[PDB]
Write an enzyme that holds these catalytic residues in place. Structure first.
Site, mmCIF file in Angstrom:
data_model
loop_
_atom_site.group_PDB
_atom_site.id
_atom_site.type_symbol
_atom_site.label_atom_id
_atom_site.label_comp_id
_atom_site.label_asym_id
_atom_site.label_seq_id
_atom_site.Cartn_x
_atom_site.Cartn_y
_atom_site.Cartn_z
ATOM 1 N N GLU A 201 -12.812 -10.616 -1.124
ATOM 2 C CA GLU A 201 -13.949 -11.318 -1.705
ATOM 3 C C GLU A 201 -15.115 -10.361 -1.928
ATOM 4 O OE1 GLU A 201 -14.856 -14.621 0.772
ATOM 5 O OE2 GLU A 201 -13.042 -15.714 0.169
ATOM 6 N N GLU B 74 -6.495 -18.659 -0.618
ATOM 7 C CA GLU B 74 -7.019 -19.281 0.595
ATOM 8 C C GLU B 74 -7.556 -20.667 0.279
ATOM 9 O OE1 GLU B 74 -9.986 -16.916 2.519
ATOM 10 O OE2 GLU B 74 -8.783 -15.080 2.551
HETATM 11 O O1 LIG Z 1 -12.097 -16.397 16.086
HETATM 12 C C1 LIG Z 1 -13.320 -15.735 16.405
HETATM 13 C C2 LIG Z 1 -13.737 -14.786 15.271
HETATM 14 O O2 LIG Z 1 -14.004 -15.490 14.032
HETATM 15 C C3 LIG Z 1 -14.620 -14.574 13.080
HETATM 16 O O3 LIG Z 1 -14.944 -15.152 11.812
HETATM 17 C C4 LIG Z 1 -13.874 -15.564 10.917
HETATM 18 C C5 LIG Z 1 -13.202 -16.962 10.984
HETATM 19 O O4 LIG Z 1 -12.632 -17.253 12.267
HETATM 20 C C6 LIG Z 1 -12.146 -16.951 9.869
HETATM 21 O O5 LIG Z 1 -11.449 -18.191 9.828
HETATM 22 C C7 LIG Z 1 -12.823 -16.716 8.503
HETATM 23 O O6 LIG Z 1 -11.834 -16.701 7.466
HETATM 24 C C8 LIG Z 1 -12.492 -16.445 6.213
HETATM 25 C C9 LIG Z 1 -11.665 -15.555 5.298
HETATM 26 O O7 LIG Z 1 -11.440 -14.279 5.922
HETATM 27 C C10 LIG Z 1 -12.457 -15.346 4.022
HETATM 28 O O8 LIG Z 1 -11.654 -14.540 3.138
HETATM 29 C C11 LIG Z 1 -12.708 -16.706 3.396
HETATM 30 O O9 LIG Z 1 -13.590 -16.511 2.305
HETATM 31 O O10 LIG Z 1 -13.464 -17.594 4.271
HETATM 32 C C12 LIG Z 1 -12.826 -17.854 5.535
HETATM 33 C C13 LIG Z 1 -13.744 -18.818 6.310
HETATM 34 O O11 LIG Z 1 -15.035 -18.227 6.503
HETATM 35 O O12 LIG Z 1 -13.394 -15.392 8.527
HETATM 36 C C14 LIG Z 1 -14.416 -15.274 9.533
HETATM 37 C C15 LIG Z 1 -14.640 -13.761 9.676
HETATM 38 O O13 LIG Z 1 -15.186 -13.205 8.475
HETATM 39 C C16 LIG Z 1 -15.960 -14.104 13.611
HETATM 40 O O14 LIG Z 1 -16.566 -13.153 12.734
HETATM 41 C C17 LIG Z 1 -15.684 -13.314 14.881
HETATM 42 O O15 LIG Z 1 -16.932 -12.830 15.414
HETATM 43 C C18 LIG Z 1 -15.034 -14.258 15.865
HETATM 44 O O16 LIG Z 1 -14.698 -13.531 17.048
#
Ligand SMILES: OC[C@H]1O[C@@H](O[C@H]2[C@H](O)[C@@H](O)[C@H](O[C@H]3[C@H](O)[C@@H](O)[C@H](O)O[C@@H]3CO)O[C@@H]2CO)[C@H](O)[C@@H](O)[C@@H]1O
Ligand SMILES: OC[C@H]1O[C@@H](O[C@H]2[C@H](O)[C@@H](O)[C@H](O[C@H]3[C@H](O)[C@@H](O)[C@H](O)O[C@@H]3CO)O[C@@H]2CO)[C@H](O)[C@@H](O)[C@@H]1O
Ligand SMILES: OC[C@H]1O[C@@H](O[C@H]2[C@H](O)[C@@H](O)[C@H](O[C@H]3[C@H](O)[C@@H](O)[C@H](O)O[C@@H]3CO)O[C@@H]2CO)[C@H](O)[C@@H](O)[C@@H]1O
Ligand SMILES: OC[C@H]1O[C@@H](O[C@H]2[C@H](O)[C@@H](O)[C@H](O[C@H]3[C@H](O)[C@@H](O)[C@H](O)O[C@@H]3CO)O[C@@H]2CO)[C@H](O)[C@@H](O)[C@@H]1O
Ligand SMILES: OC[C@H]1O[C@@H](O[C@H]2[C@H](O)[C@@H](O)[C@H](O[C@H]3[C@H](O)[C@@H](O)[C@H](O)O[C@@H]3CO)O[C@@H]2CO)[C@H](O)[C@@H](O)[C@@H]1O
Ligand SMILES: OC[C@H]1O[C@@H](O[C@H]2[C@H](O)[C@@H](O)[C@H](O[C@H]3[C@H](O)[C@@H](O)[C@H](O)O[C@@H]3CO)O[C@@H]2CO)[C@H](O)[C@@H](O)[C@@H]1O
Lengths: 107, 345, 345, 107, 107, 345, 107, 345
Positions: free
Chosen positions: F149, F272
């Site tokens: 992204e 996703e």
């Molecule tokens: O489980 C604890 C960790 O979570 C981390 O953040 C992530 C979320 O858990 C994850 O589901 C989310 O997935 C993203 C995806 O990578 C992205 O491509 C899409 O656009 O959106 C999804 C939902 O946001 O990503 C975030 C991480 O970027 C925490 O950052 C971490 O500190 C924590 O330990």
């Protein structure tokens, strides 16, 4: 005429100048592969050109599109090109232009 | 040298513009039986120097590989042959030119029929793999042309659009050739590539049925347009050219190509054209200059077919350069052609 | 009777399919100096009955209005002339046929130059207003064709695509004519209308520069394609037709039209075509049948140009129907043409 | 073959039947203005056809597109037409099919 | 209705059959992403399908386009797909269909 | 295994159809600092077996390479890390699945501004050269996704389409990435490749400005569509989904994508999506099944984002598979999603 | 920059002038709905403009496309507009321009 | 006056540019039960003068015809009502403005279902024939809008794209209306006409399924975009507007329209938009000015919905002009909106 030619001076430095030309098609038919012809003013020489190419023959200057800009769309479409010239003294401008045989309005 | 300038990501039209106007080393590396087998001298750097000095910026280098390769499965191309093609290409690169290398008189094996398809593909893959591998380091001033004039042989079919079968199989061959080139990697994955219609014909049937391999924007269309036929090619056709009708007819042929390809962003090279010598210099001058400016006005880069044979009154006398003398056998025609092309300074 | 059946809203291609194949009442209402002035008898209901019987579903009714109208500003068309055109149209309506009415030999006033545009538009407007008003009552089996072969005058220009100026002004005249027809309202608001390219030519230059008035989906393109020229039209051209090259060349002519118009949903009628009589019936039979089926495979409806002149060995001998005794002068050519068109039962 | 023909019976009524034909182009090149040819069984006659027109010539049956459906797109494109037949004896299907000169597969 | 569905038997072998379905759109608006739904006789099971995928829920059958054939053009456009079934008893065919919620004519 | 099946030349839409429906190994190889660093256990072959058995045919394998690579100029990737990625990929190839491998949380270095462009391109080239080289032998069941992204940094810009500068530079990076991949040759020159819009957003601003590298027909668009936002993503948003409004809004989102890409032959993967757990299984079941069938009706293949976190009432709870148990935490959601996708048998 | 702006003088008459402006997009992404912003030199006022509209705030000028010329195509596409000014002093030109936020090269 | 200036053949985008920016005479002639029955005073020339003076160049004049017409077959419209509409239009033409006249709250009879189609088309035809005939002499500064927001009835369907059936039938109604207008001839055959998507919605579903009647180039798409919903329209929604996200979201809505229509040469008028009074003048000023300039940057002409109701804290408070006083209830909002639009001098 429904075709207008705008001949404008971008920059000049006494012994030379840079010109930008814009051709506007206000008619109903696209011009598919434009060419532009005029009479080169005396004491003027094209040194180099971009977005187009030319053939200078006598006082005749014939300019051809560069392909990617070859179509001048109808109902107000434009295409443009530019060039540098060398000149002596009074920077004159062509008085008439022909686009694919069609006599233009100078704007 | 323009040999190793890397590969740009500009639109193919920009490449075609820089190519500008070209000259074929005809009846040479394309000659059946070898470089000198059809009456041309061994090619020299000095010859190509003259081509550049005249105003040409592209050397098309047609190569017949049949006769220089072994049998299935490898179809190994003779190494001396391969390196000789490369030597000649560098004559041109030393002059800051573009070079086009193709497969030329390959009709004994390159047959556009469903029944030959599997085996032809295998050979095409091996052939292009070897050529591409040899030229891998060369930058975007080297252009590959996948085939010359793939077509059904047979006299009655010579000026036809062939069958749907033939046109379909030609499209499949172009894809096979392009993938083979790209699969060698490096600059070959990104260089500009020319592909022909069936017979490299610009007729509606064949240009309407052309399919661009992978829709690749680096692909340029290859057409051969010896127009008008009776003037340019037929030893028994008219020796005059220049009427309003002549001009309009030639314009119209180019307009078909402009409308199909150029104005939609698909660049086109006329890899072969020219006129034979009917002892009619003034007509050939009028025709050459008009062809050049008319084609250029449709974004097309024309490449003169020069087979080294210039004798007035004989068929196939497309030659304008005298390779033994390093002078022009048809100076007026050459100059007129170049004059018609114009320039940016 | 396809007189007053209303005006359907179907794709123009469906109309063209229904028109199917046509016959021209040539050198009649288009003849300078009146209906019988170029050697044809007064048209009768019986004649048209025979046309239908042979398998034609379209009558093209060319009309020259110059010589039958008053001065500016009203350009009033002689009532008796108008009434005669309508009477003939109704011979066809009685047979459930399509009818095309045009402006035909208007070259003395209809000139495609910027200098004439203002005068020509005023007259074009008045002429079409009157024709449209007179024929308003008829349903979608009546088609208006805005102009015949608008082109710059001069024999040297006859087979050219004119200048940009000429093609621009022709597009302007088509707009003027369509607007004049539409402005009368009623059935004329939704009627199907044919417009020609410059000279009604199919060449790339002219088909590529055609602009459909208002992008109106009820507009059909009008082309004249007497192909191939030497065989079909030239008294000194070959008398033979039917080689692989012949077939391929004709196919390619139609392919240009298919790709530009038909495949994009723009319907096309070949309003005039045919071959002259060079005492070559078998060749003409081969040509007519192949023309019909080749054209029809690109969605085109061909209309034979019949000028009532059928003498073997003379120029302009396109006539195939014998109007004096209601038989066919060229039964075999006619039957072959119709046979090639095929049918839905 | 990269071109397939499906010849299927929509409905039958003892003395006749309704047929649907689908032509499928699995090749890389569009078929611009399709035509379809086959050998007509004995005892069968086409009484009317829609979305296409035909010429019966000996035992050969030649079908032509209706213009608006003239292009069969590459890579899986289809076009379809149908027609009614009168028949006697056994209701046979044509054995071969060729489209613009190319021998088809029968699905 | 302006949407017509043709459901035809291409071939049958006592215990199974091959079906071809053509959907025709005679209306003014393209169908962008077609889906076809019907109720399937109980003696029949779809074994495999091409040019489309399906969800079978009891006798409710929902067929979805394969992307490349997702648009049924206006004014007579068609798209087609096919499938094999296993069946016992007498081979029947569905008699009602809906395309994107529009009830179709069965031809 | 589907690991080494070679590379087809079919349209990308067919590949997307066969991909069918997918599951993300989220918060794993993409986790900052290592596979287990965000609470997930080490991935096993047994885990991936369950994914296939539930009916998923595609494993998206997000990978964050930042933190496992050296400094300029080589940016050498830890070989152990690379091999681990390859190993997990083979869990899925063993199940005859498709695998997508991307670059994921690369935002510390992948900055879409003119000022960073030269350095970012240099790193992108080195990174993709290494990944591509490693997987060169893998067939068309292996898909590369050039970036995740890519977007301007800043919380206030997260749901924006960035500036023209940002979108222009993203397009440049996609071309860079694709060229780097293709330049390694072999199956990499012909494999299918996914490229994202800015932020992988489906919003009009970003889909309208996407430029496909070389117009390459083997390229697939990568979009992330957690729709509708409030229900699917927002812990403070509605827990309910199922109204005509809900259904219509979702359809319309997919309609934008179908119209811009799919219907024009440009294939699209929704790499996703999914919903969080607001103790609302029935609503999620309804949403998941409708999403699957609505997306599939537009030729779209959706891939569930599964971060392994499924705790009711918490934010970011997209997890539906229990990795430690080899059972489904949200069996009903899973089954409804799979059910909505359908199949060919 | 991959965006070039050519600011040229078509004609001038001491207290006023006619200007032609051409925007050229040499990037890979089309500019869909162009807006051009710059600072006018002091002692210059825009009297009227064609092929675009503007909002003036002090010497800050913001110009918007006229819809039909809204997209500047990638890889060398152009659009052009013009306007008249009154001025005093030397006929100076702007020293930089921004197109949809992107800094332009002044050519 | 611009009442009787005839009709140009210019591109519709030029017409929309000249319309520039507009104001709705809302809750007036569209009011159920008479001009003043919804709280507005009798309209005066003086009011319209103030509209022009403020910088608006277009008056949209919504009219509900239901309640002022008889039953089948003629659905005769009360002549007093017809002349009052005309009188008001002339207040605007006297100010050299454009005027749009539509059918407004016709939901009781205008039902977009197959079952109702025949009867609804009959009424539509009768209604538009009468309106068109009454205004036949007016030039191109009078624009007809065929329908307002045709949609399936029902609260739950309010913000949906209806079914395919609904959208198909809306397209059929637009063609019926346009044909009725054109059939009256004269200026009606060539004037510019606006047609709505289902619900006049700009959502992907509805803009993608819009079919332009006869592909007519003089047709302008009519869209209503009170965006963003929560700020502009929802009394229980945010009172703030102006973040990077707000701006990007608005840009994106306009981008969908730009890409679908405007950039392809199909012109678009946002016939209704605006914000209610949540005692948030600063926010509404920020929104109004950005809306104007963003819309205009995509070739769109926006028209403010003013129902004459401007009370702070209340739903449906779109009013910004105080008709009884000839002043502005929301001077700052009005001025920002106009300032956003810019000018040619
Ligand atoms: O489980 C604890 C960790 O979570 C981390 O953040 C992530 C979320 O858990 C994850 O589901 C989310 O997935 C993203 C995806 O990578 C992205 O491509 C899409 O656009 O959106 C999804 C939902 O946001 O990503 C975030 C991480 O970027 C925490 O950052 C971490 O500190 C924590 O330990
Ligand atoms: O006389 C030497 C040998 O000439 C061979 O004929 C060639 C012509 O001299 C040459 O001009 C012609 O060029 C072709 C070109 O290769 C083809 O791509 C293009 O389409 O048309 C051009 C003009 O025909 O090629 C022919 C060879 O095919 C004689 O065939 C050979 O016997 C003779 O020794
Ligand atoms: O001159 C009038 C006739 O023109 C015919 O169209 C010609 C096209 O304008 C012309 O572009 C085309 O040219 C072909 C050429 O024939 C072919 O050999 C070459 O390989 O490609 C060229 C570009 O496609 O030829 C056609 C046919 O002559 C009209 O079809 C005809 O009705 C008209 O009178
Ligand atoms: O002999 C009677 C008169 O004939 C006139 O010439 C015409 C031919 O007889 C006629 O067949 C030809 O038809 C045209 C058609 O009008 C035109 O639209 C199409 O382009 O070409 C056809 C073939 O040329 O028209 C010519 C007339 O223009 C003689 O001119 C006349 O003297 C003679 O009495
Ligand atoms: O903001 C991110 C989300 O955007 C979604 O796309 C949106 C389009 O960008 C936007 O143009 C569109 O706007 C519609 C509006 O919804 C409708 O009510 C109005 O009448 O017309 C507007 C213009 O078409 O809405 C869509 C959907 O919200 C993406 O689909 C989503 O994935 C993304 O996160
Ligand atoms: O003034 C009292 C009457 O108000 C009526 O409702 C209207 C609102 O006052 C009016 O602003 C709203 O305008 C519509 C517009 O017509 C439509 O095209 C657009 O899409 O939405 C606007 C509302 O957001 O129309 C409603 C009427 O339909 C009450 O109905 C009436 O009872 C009351 O007396």
């Amino acid at each position: 005429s429904a075709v207008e030619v705008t001949y404008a001076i971008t920059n000049s430095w006494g012994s030379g100048a840079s010109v930008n030309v814009t051709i506007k098609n206000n008619g109903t038919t696209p011009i598919n592969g434009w060419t532009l012809k005029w009479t080169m003013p005396i004491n003027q020489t094209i040194t180099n050109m971009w977005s187009a190419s030319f053939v200078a023959s006598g006082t005749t200057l014939s300019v051809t599109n560069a392909g990617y800009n070859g179509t001048i769309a109808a109902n107000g479409g434009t295409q443009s090109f530019g060039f540098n010239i060398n000149y002596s003294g009074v920077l004159s401008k062509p008085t008439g232009f022909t686009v694919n045989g069609t006599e233009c309005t100078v704007k | 040298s323009t040999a190793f300038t890397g590969v740009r990501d500009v639109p193919a039209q920009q490449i075609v513009n820089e190519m500008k106007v070209g000259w074929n080393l005809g009846n040479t590396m394309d000659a059946i039986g070898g470089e000198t087998n059809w009456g041309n001298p061994m090619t020299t750097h000095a010859m190509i120097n003259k081509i550049k000095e005249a105003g040409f910026n592209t050397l098309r280098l047609p190569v017949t590989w049949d006769g220089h390769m072994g049998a299935a499965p490898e179809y190994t191309i003779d190494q001396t042959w391969m390196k000789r093609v490369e030597e000649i290409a560098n004559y041109a690169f030393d002059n800051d030119m573009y070079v086009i290398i193709n497969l030329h008189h390959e009709n004994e094996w390159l047959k556009p029929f469903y029944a030959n398809e599997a085996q032809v593909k295998a050979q095409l893959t091996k052939v292009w793999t070897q050529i591409a591998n040899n030229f891998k380091k060369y930058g975007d001033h080297l252009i590959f042309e996948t085939m010359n004039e793939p077509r059904p042989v047979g006299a009655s079919l010579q000026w036809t659009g062939g069958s749907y079968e033939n046109r379909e199989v030609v499209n499949r061959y172009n894809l096979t050739a392009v993938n083979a080139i790209r699969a060698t990697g490096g600059n070959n994955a990104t260089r500009y590539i020319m592909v022909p219609t069936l017979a490299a014909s610009a007729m509606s049937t064949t240009i309407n049925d052309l399919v661009i391999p992978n829709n690749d924007s680096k692909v340029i269309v290859s057409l051969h347009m010896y127009s008008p036929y009776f003037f340019a090619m037929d030893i028994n056709g008219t020796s005059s050219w220049g009427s309003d009708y002549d001009k309009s007819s030639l314009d119209s042929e180019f307009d078909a190509v402009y409308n199909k390809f150029v104005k939609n962003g698909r660049a086109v090279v006329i890899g072969e054209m020219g006129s034979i010598n009917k002892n009619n210099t003034a007509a050939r001058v009028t025709h050459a200059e008009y062809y050049a400016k008319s084609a250029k006005a449709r974004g097309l880069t024309p490449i003169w077919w020069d087979n080294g044979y210039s004798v007035a009154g004989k068929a196939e006398t497309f030659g304008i350069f005298n390779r033994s003398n390093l002078t022009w056998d048809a100076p007026e025609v050459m100059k007129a052609f170049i004059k018609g092309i114009g320039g940016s300074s």
